[PDB]
Design a protein around this ligand. Structure first.
Ligand SMILES: O=C(O)[C@H]1O[C@@H](O[C@H]2[C@H](O)[C@H](O)[C@H](O[C@H]3[C@H](O)[C@H](O)[C@H](O)O[C@H]3C(=O)O)O[C@@H]2C(=O)O)[C@@H](O)[C@@H](O)[C@@H]1O
Length: 227
């Protein structure tokens, strides 16, 4: 009978994307009002808890299901997003409780988006496996090329991680447990200046197999700042 996550976290500038068959989205307002379900709930430890099955519905340009928050600078218009200039920082603490058969989920992101709201590549993906978090930074803004890996080894299932993802003036700074690495993405491809960005945090399950099971990820803190 614990309070729902929207009472414990500031979700006024997040919407929730779900792994039901119809990939339903829950508005910022409904999160604040106390939305909770099998996909999104407060656990006994107070954590904002994201559950998604590998059989879940998937968004138009992903093969994989998610129960994941999507940052909304304007909760009434998803086309309003931030740019490469200035400082944009997401901080979180959390843990991954259960993995699917693939042993891989994504627990935080910066996602690119076109000015018109059209999809663009992810910029940063925090990839969790039992024993390693890889904070991947995409090389090119058109999706060509590969990713710059940033491995933080020794992070296990159930361990508490403290994460920060920051963009300042076209450079990404990725931090786990006080260990920061940087990638100059605008310096790799000036095309990134032609995209906008939004944060994501939750449980984006890198397994779509019918027998893959499901994943659980938890957050104990989540904050975003733009300056
Ligand atoms: O790394 C990834 O997250 C993964 O996501 C894929 O893009 C998704 C993106 O994560 C959002 O879920 C986005 O949400 C938009 C979609 O149209 C949705 O139905 C609703 O209308 O809201 C939209 C929004 O908030 O902008 O949908 C994207 C999508 O088109 O699938 C891909 O980038 C994938 O390759 C990537 O690995």
């Amino acid at each position: 009978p614990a309070a729902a996550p929207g009472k414990n976290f500031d979700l006024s500038h997040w919407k929730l994307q779900l792994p039901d068959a119809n990939t339903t989205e829950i508005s910022s307002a409904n999160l604040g009002l106390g939305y909770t379900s099998q996909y999104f709930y407060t656990d006994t430890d107070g954590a904002m808890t994201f559950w998604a099955p590998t059989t879940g519905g998937t968004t138009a340009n992903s093969s994989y299901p998610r129960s994941e928050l999507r940052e909304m600078l304007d909760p009434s218009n998803s086309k309003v997003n931030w740019g490469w200039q200035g400082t944009h920082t997401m901080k979180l603490s959390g843990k991954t409780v259960q993995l699917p058969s693939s042993g891989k989920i994504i627990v935080a992101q910066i996602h690119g988006i076109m000015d018109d709201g059209t999809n663009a590549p992810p910029l940063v993906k925090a990839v969790f496996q039992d024993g390693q978090l890889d904070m991947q930074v995409k090389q090119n803004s058109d999706g060509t090329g590969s990713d710059v890996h940033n491995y933080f080894t020794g992070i296990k299932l159930g361990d508490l991680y403290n994460m920060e993802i920051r963009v300042t003036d076209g450079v990404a700074y990725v931090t786990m447990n006080g260990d920061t690495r940087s990638v100059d993405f605008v310096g790799k491809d000036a095309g990134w200046k032609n995209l906008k960005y939004y944060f994501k945090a939750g449980n984006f399950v890198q397994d779509n197999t019918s027998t893959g099971g499901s994943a659980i990820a938890k957050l104990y803190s989540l904050s975003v700042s733009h300056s």
